[PDB]
């Protein structure tokens, strides 16, 4: 069933995190803080819609600015794109 979908999904999430993070001017100013972002991606990783859903307002703010710029990799699977056409993500510098 969900055979091996779980691992890829966790993986892909962590790859979104690192793409957003790579676009920070000062990613160390936010080191312990947490932000929850709700993301919608196209079939090829292109940003469609982004909104925050919990956590630090300052971090949430910078993390949306960085999300505008990130190059997000292409979903490697139907199951993964199924999840990340709409999904919440904990972002932690």
């Amino acid at each position: 069933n969900n055979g091996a979908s779980g691992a890829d999904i966790n993986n892909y999430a962590g790859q979104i995190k690192s793409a957003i993070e790579s676009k920070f001017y000062d990613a160390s100013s936010y080191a312990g803080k947490t932000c929850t972002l709700r993301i919608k991606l196209a079939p090829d990783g292109m940003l469609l819609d982004i909104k925050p859903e919990g956590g630090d307002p300052a971090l949430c703010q910078a993390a949306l600015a960085a999300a505008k710029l990130a190059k997000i990799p292409k979903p490697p699977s139907q199951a993964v794109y199924e999840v990340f056409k709409n999904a919440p993500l904990d972002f932690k510098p």
Binding site: R38, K40, A42, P43, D44, M46, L47, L48, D49, I50, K51, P52, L64, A67, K68, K85
Partner: protein, 49 residues
């Protein structure tokens, strides 16, 4: 498969995001504020609701 105050976003086939039947790219598309977040539209950034 969705819509914003500026319109409806549909996923085409061959998997391109379209709006008004337009396959929006990184080039005719920008990210515009929407409440506490952003959302992508194309050439209608100033279109009142």
């Amino acid at each position: 498969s969705y819509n914003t105050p500026w319109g409806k976003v549909i996923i085409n086939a061959a998997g391109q995001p379209t709006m008004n039947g337009t396959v929006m790219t990184a080039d005719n598309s920008s990210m515009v504020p929407y409440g506490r977040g952003f959302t992508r539209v194309l050439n209608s950034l100033v279109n009142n609701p």
